[PDB]
Design a protein around this ligand. Structure first.
Ligand SMILES: CC(=O)N[C@@H]1[C@@H](O[C@@H]2O[C@H](CO)[C@H](O)[C@H](O)[C@H]2O)[C@H](O)[C@@H](CO)O[C@H]1O
Ligand SMILES: [Ca+2]
Length: 226
């Protein structure tokens, strides 16, 4: 979808950053082959399956540069380390093996074409736009109903890097959902943004990520171009 639907929350001062949920991604029993759990590849793991793992935390105000590379000292071993500052989560977690969901709204600074580019170890699935990610100011009631991924990247496959080129309006806030998994060993997440305006990729999303409370009537976007 080249013209994704946006939202018009018309809230006085919007809340900065996305919401995050972290969940466990345990290795298989210590004599299993391979050592890692393959659930991350089942089609419903990003929808229902992650909820069968342990909730590690629900965090708010995730904003900044969310990109990271984590080098595991060794493979098939659950090891602890920390996420970047932007994630608002300071305590060590199993960086070798975990699940992470981010959701909220993306607001453009300038109207025009935006190319989001992603790469991941092991997995990054992105939904973007109302309906596709979730409904405007109706996130809780549409949370699990996200459609086809607007970008997807899986380590070791024939689509390990992906992009999404969309025409966006600076007036609107766009529902976004980002689902990440590290099954084992190294972990990495790269999201960048390229517009027809700037000369280089944007990697710091501080002024771009927002959160909005759900409302009874919702907040459909009030910019349309048919
Ligand atoms: C198969 C491979 O390339 N590497 C194995 C290690 O695990 C993978 O490492 C990659 C990065 O190279 C990804 O992070 C992937 O998610 C991992 O599963 C594995 O842990 C060890 C064996 O102990 O070495 C490689 O076999
Ligand atoms: Ca990995």
């Amino acid at each position: 979808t080249e013209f994704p639907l946006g939202c018009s929350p018309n809230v006085t001062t919007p809340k900065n950053g996305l919401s995050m949920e972290l969940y466990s991604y345990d290795y298989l029993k210590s004599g299993s082959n391979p050592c890692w759990d393959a659930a991350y590849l089942d089609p419903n793991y990003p929808r229902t399956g992650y909820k069968s793992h342990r909730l590690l935390a629900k965090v708010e105000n995730v904003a900044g540069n969310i990109n990271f590379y984590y080098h595991a000292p060794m493979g098939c071993t659950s090891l602890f380390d920390t996420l970047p500052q932007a994630y608002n989560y300071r305590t060590p977690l199993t960086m070798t093996n975990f699940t992470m969901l981010l959701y909220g709204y993306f607001k453009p600074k300038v109207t025009g074409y935006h190319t989001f580019t992603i790469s991941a170890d092991d997995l990054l699935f992105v939904n973007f736009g109302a309906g596709n990610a979730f409904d405007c100011c109706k996130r809780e009631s549409s949370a699990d109903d996200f459609g086809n991924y607007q970008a997807y990247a899986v380590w070791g496959s024939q689509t390990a890097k992906d992009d999404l080129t969309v025409h966006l309006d600076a007036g609107l806030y766009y529902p976004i959902r980002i689902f990440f998994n590290n099954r084992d060993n190294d972990g990495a997440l790269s999201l960048t943004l390229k517009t027809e305006s700037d000369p280089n990729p944007v990697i710091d999303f501080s002024d771009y990520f927002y959160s909005f409370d759900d409302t009874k009537d919702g907040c459909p976007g009030l910019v349309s171009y048919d």
